[model samples]
Target: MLKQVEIFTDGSCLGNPGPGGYGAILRYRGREKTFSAGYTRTTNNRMELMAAIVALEALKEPCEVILSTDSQYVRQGITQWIHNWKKRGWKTADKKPVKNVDLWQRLDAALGQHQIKWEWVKGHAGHPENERCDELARAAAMNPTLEDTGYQVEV
Candidate 1:
């Protein structure tokens, strides 16, 4: 049977478009799991989106999910802007392409597999789960990293 789960996600970069990482905490029933990774070249938004994607992907079956994040870009993109973007064939309002389209598409696929409620919280404000995610993200950011294979960083 599918279960309802709560999740917290965070992402950080040493510099925007520099080394970065993402973290997630997922709680289901009385059990908990965490996920995190780093990329040698990536943006904060990419990491943010990836954190949520990784969390959802961890579930082996469809679930009811409550996903929380500190990233307005991630939250708004998923909750509000995605509809219009899809309506426009993934184009932005200004007729330009969307940023992090690969991650967005991955997230959209994950989203389609479950029901989700999106929540936003103030980052670094001592929310325990969020804070732990931040620490995990930062720690990974400090590690030797992997190239973000999907994202092409513009110089």
Candidate 2:
């Protein structure tokens, strides 16, 4: 049996290299679940990918998912750029190392079990679920005690 799921996600950062947060909402068969987490130090792009990563990781079984996100970084990278990055051994087109590789790898790991259709939505443009997720992310961004083990400041 194929389980159908819908997910909405948003991410926030206090500063480019400061506390960050991600929010995700998963909906299945009339049930709704929301997830939000804070990080001590990270990037907006990291939080963006993290929201999708955590939401997909939360699923216990294979599902058919409509994964919606506001960040083009997550949406396009997963649906379009990931394959090239993988083929290049996680390098970009110009032979540059990829940013946020860990999250990308984590998100990729969470992908094989599910069939996902990525959706992009405009942020703060009156979408109900998007609005809620934004609130979740914004609140979590303020409380940043969680250490992001993979995050490092580039020299």
Candidate 3:
């Protein structure tokens, strides 16, 4: 028998291309899994994508995953927009190169190997766990104590 897991994730940034953080919660088999990271510089959208990627990677096997998030960019980008962007050579509506293509590619790769369902949740609402994730993300963004989630670069 296989176990079903519910994953909730969120990301926050103090400013665009600035201090950032992400959080994830995974629950299954009567156990809970939680993970988070803070970065010295990044974007909220990047963190949002990273949260879901990390949560999916944490799975031990190919199980049913219910992923919930609050970022429209993360949700729509993953569920719908990414494919078009990729097909168009990662360009946007005005034929501009997509921002954060690297993170989007990484997120797409992670999603490729799973059977998961993504849902959108209202942030800062009465959802306790979701609120907690937002808190964690905000805290991490304000005081990121580590490298930018292993993705900082010089360009």
Q: What's the lDDT for all of these models? A: 0.84, 0.84, 0.78
TM-score, every prediction: 0.89, 0.90, 0.83
- State candidate 3's TM-score: 0.83
Residue-level lDDT of model 3, residues 1-155, one tens digit each, is: 23667888888998767899988887866878788888888878788888888887776667777777778888778778887988898888787767777788777777776778867877655256677778888888887876655454432
Kindly provide the TM-score of model 1 when superposed on the true structure, using C-alpha atoms.
Answer: 0.89
lDDT of 1 by residue, 31-65 (tens): 78998888998888888888998898887788889
Candidate number with greatest TM-score? 2
Show pairs that collide, candidate 2.
none
Model 3: worst 10 consecutive residues (lDDT sum): 146-155
Residue 26 of model 1 has an lDDT of 93
Candidate 1: worst 10 consecutive residues by lDDT?
146-155
- Residue pairs with backbone overlap in model 3: none
- Count clashing residue pairs per candidate: 0, 0, 0
Model 2 spans with C-alpha error above 4 angstroms: 1-3, 93-96
For candidate 2, give the lDDT of residue 55.
87
Give the C-alpha lDDT of model 1: 0.84
